[PDB]
């Protein structure tokens, strides 16, 4: 029998609400086809993941380990012994003897038993925290994705902004070669090709570094994707209630995963517990003995056996005490840690939430921005092309642009990070 | 007896001054009453702090169980035993027992004495580290508040800049409705109201997520505090002595707490050279046996007992040596952490006290910066308005005083965070 | 003998080459003789690797530990025994004994001998581990070096643009004087000289901090080093054939450690076989007896002894085969250990040759940049001093050329830091 406690799941230690449904498949939240290549692949591949597994079968192996504590054994035994005096008849004694025994724990009180559930609620946990390997690797693999992705995107619009800056200096020239502007608006335009060029540079390398940060993640070493086009459909963006419950949280892997460790928990004080009381063992042997090999093993040396044993704890100086209390504290500490792991969830639902307004109404601003910026440009073209402003205007007009549009892809790149972030956070697929 | 060297202190690791006291309470050392508020909810809630105190109770049932190995057991043993033959007479022999038996280790050279004080000192060690946790969370909770006021400031300003521009806007256009400015200037001022209207929901979402922290750090999720006037004297700034001693850092609980553990091992080290030493036991045993089970109880068949026993260890194959090397290269190994964690603890002090200078000094020079703002974006309306100068002045006046502005926030955060960091690292309240 | 299977190298889980020779040693790689002066230093006194020194003794004497546990065994023991009845004759009967034991297990199977070697390259593991916290720390001070001096040379140019602005600012007062310029003009040369103080404060804090880490990682708090004049010759950059095989990462420390730990499982394999064989041992004694002390150690009451034992498993519900399997998982677990531990050194190699050329590319292309500027500066200025175009003109010049400058600098350093990371990643001196 178990001297366990009952499971109770802790009380609810957020709010019953996130701020005021279930998750598809990634299959299906991810539109974007090369991006799940690289997630199936990553799920092959992938050392992380190939560990997280490893430990879930050698978690399974310590449970069949532990339950096999539980059952009888049955062993062989040989022995010969030489023996003889010092002095006063020095004649050696000799003894073989040959043992067949078996050996069982009752367990009546579930020490055994209980030892035995704590390492399969281990086991439990072990399986849970793979599958958070898993859904972590997914969100990881397509943001590693998505970081690619842009930096592609911003070293094209770098390039076509080179472009543009080369075409401003040959118009500057042209007008000088005319005596109709200065050298001053000419180094200005040169220069920015230069910064230009340095930008190119900078996103060549943040390219090479996403690449071979995708690899890593792969565990695999073929051709990279190449540059597409992505935008806000490349993910199906979580469509939420608005008094979608905290309740979700509970089916993370992660929080599973603690809930499996305070029943582990629980197990363990069974097992403390059951140290207080008698345990009752059994052991049952064939046997044999002579004093020759010769008429050893013949039937008439041989005896059966059978032995049933109690042993009675009775006082122990607090040994079994303060066992029992490391249990219970222990189990104490399983019940925080399941806390800590469902308010650590309900942050990262929360900031997420927040910040997919945040970001949209960033994006938002940044477009009005832009397309200011574009207008700006003209009118400072134009002005500037018939005498009225000096070229500086161009030049604050053409920095503020080009800044503008390397801001907005990190822009739109967060967003897909942080929706990735939010699908993750909910439990993923 | 124990066979553990004395504690010795190692040297100071460290120069004895910080470059050429006693902290007051943090109820003292905070002013702004909102924080402590939430320190004090913190304190009460937090789920890192409470692990941190079970971890104490955890240390201090380890520590009773080793003790309690010191002490006598009292148990109580039943047994029946059923034998015979296989062959020559197969009558079966039986014969029960019960014996109730007293156990005790003399420990002359105190091998268990000296496990348990290890034990006593690694539970030392352990409220040292909870005491230790205990001001970290003071730490970062008084910063996650001022870290969310930075927030509120800085979306205060943020929308009062929306409203400046949206005035200089409608200012710009008045001017073109009497055919006097022209339509780059006019692109210009909407232009800047759309990234300020971008900024805003940037700092939109730093509240939330500030908000956000500050919940998971008080573990709990009661009405956040609103945005108050937050200054200098909202923390009452640590004043030190000119030729202040690094040995203020001694009381530190990260640093007793290495303390503790420096005792742990000299503990180990008596423990591990008793091995090399005799060890007497001594069992006594009250006991009984009969055939049959009428006549087992019968005092007849009862009989007391009384056995000293001693064990010599004699030739080992440098066992006992080398775990004896084992516990006095882990002692050296604890000197080494004693020593790292004063090193790294005057790093702290060191840098606070470098930073606040620096951080005092970057304030005064960007104060005197935005009043030569305040006055260069007036002189450029002027000179703007009656057509001197183009439209571009007034921008980049207005664009620097705003970046000045934020920047200037961000910097008094910086000093109230490294006046905490300090007042932490001089080890808190 | 031994069960534990053969070694295998895993099969290379990165490409053959980094994309399409041996490191000097450190005192080569680095030219510049300050920072040679503070690794040696640093060696010496460095706490982390003083104890990771310590890791590998402590290993060495669990190794020896180990291996003791194959050597015989010699003990004394020394008992005296009063017991007598409870009633029909309550005399007491008194026996002494003295018992001199050795003992030795055969270990044919290899099961003590495997335990032994897995012990002995753990060892060897944490040799490895030891020289890699070696080559870390060599990169690492030298990385802390020439933070150093970028925080040094930040200073200096920040205190020059302070005299250059200084300057511009006392001609427009002349200027001004001379009711040739304006208060517009006179308020922005003043801003712009605040702002440089408010740099200035800055990198002064940034070189205290500087030196507080360099202090940390030294162990030691002499005198830092000065400014000095620092470039791309202060270190022997690596030349590296163009297929250079990616072979070339076995021979990192950290590489070797995962061999070592793979070889360490091998053997539990080998230990974990052995288990389900018979076990040999062998026990042999002089002792004596006597019911008085004084004919106690009379040759008379002596007798010798000789007793082989041999064990044999032969049902034990599966926990050897658990036990097994425990050990061959961990193998498999060591596989992948090691074959990360590869990938990412391979990550490291080629993030390190892909920044070399970007950051080459943003330095060359920068220069031209502050070429540019400085010929922008001096056109500005002669164009404003002939009323031809605002102050606007000269402090956007200024502006940029400094920000310019502050990001070359900071660029030279990042390439430094690179070109250390990429001799590092090889596997250092």
Same mark, same amino acid.
């Given at each position: ?352 939430? !927040?910040? +997919? @307004?945040? *970001?949209? $109404?960033?994006?938002? =601003?940044? %477009?009005?921005?832009?397309? &200011? #910026?574009?207008?700006? /440009? ?24 080009? !800044?503008? +549009? @390397?801001? *907005?892809? $990190?822009?739109?790149? =967060?967003? %897909?990070?942080?929706?990735? &972030? #939010?699908?993750?956070? /909910?439990?993923?697929?």
């Amino acid at each position: 029998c178990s001297l366990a406690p009952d499971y109770q799941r802790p009380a609810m230690p957020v709010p019953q609400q996130f701020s005021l449904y279930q998750n598809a498949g990634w299959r299906t939240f991810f539109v974007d086809n090369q991006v799940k290549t690289l997630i199936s692949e990553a799920l092959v591949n992938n050392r992380d993941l190939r560990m997280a597994t490893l430990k879930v079968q050698e978690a399974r192996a310590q449970y069949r380990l532990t339950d096999a504590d539980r059952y009888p054994q049955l062993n062989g035994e040989g022995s010969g012994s030489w023996s003889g005096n010092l002095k006063g008849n020095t004649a050696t004694t000799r003894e073989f003897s040959t043992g067949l025994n078996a050996s069982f724990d009752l367990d009546f009180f579930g020490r055994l038993k209980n030892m035995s559930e704590a390492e399969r609620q281990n086991y439990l946990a072990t399986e849970e925290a793979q599958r958070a390997v898993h859904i972590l690797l997914v969100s990881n693999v397509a943001q590693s994705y998505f970081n690619q992705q842009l930096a592609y995107a911003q070293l094209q619009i770098a390039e076509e902004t080179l472009r543009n800056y080369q075409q401003s200096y040959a118009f500057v020239e042209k007008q000088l070669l005319t005596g109709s502007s200065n050298v001053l608006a000419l180094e200005q335009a040169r220069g920015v090709i230069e910064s230009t060029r340095s930008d190119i540079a900078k996103r060549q390398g943040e390219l090479a570094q996403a690449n071979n940060a995708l690899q890593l993640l792969l565990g695999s070493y073929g051709k990279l994707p190449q540059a597409q086009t992505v935008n806000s459909d490349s993910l199906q963006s979580v469509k939420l209630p608005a008094g979608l419950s905290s309740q979700i949280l509970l089916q993370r892997p992660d929080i599973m995963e603690a809930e499996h460790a305070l029943m582990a928990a629980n197990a363990n004080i069974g097992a403390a517990r059951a140290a207080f009381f008698p345990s009752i063992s059994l052991t049952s042997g064939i046997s044999t003995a002579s004093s020759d090999l010769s008429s050893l093993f013949n039937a008439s040396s041989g005896m059966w056996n059978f032995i049933p044993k109690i042993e009675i704890p009775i006082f122990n100086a607090g040994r079994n005490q303060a066992n029992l209390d490391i249990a219970e504290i222990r189990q104490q500490q399983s019940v925080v840690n399941y806390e800590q792991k469902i308010q650590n969830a309900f942050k990262e639902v929360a900031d997420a939430l !927040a910040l +997919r @307004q945040s *970001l949209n $109404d960033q994006i938002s =601003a940044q %477009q009005r921005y832009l397309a &200011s #910026l574009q207008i700006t /440009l003209q009118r400072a073209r134009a002005l500037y092309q018939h005498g009225a402003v000096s070229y500086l205007e161009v030049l604050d007009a053409e920095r503020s642009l080009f !800044a503008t +549009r @390397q801001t *907005l892809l $990190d822009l739109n790149y =967060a967003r %897909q990070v942080n929706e990735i &972030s #939010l699908y993750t956070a /909910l439990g993923g697929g």
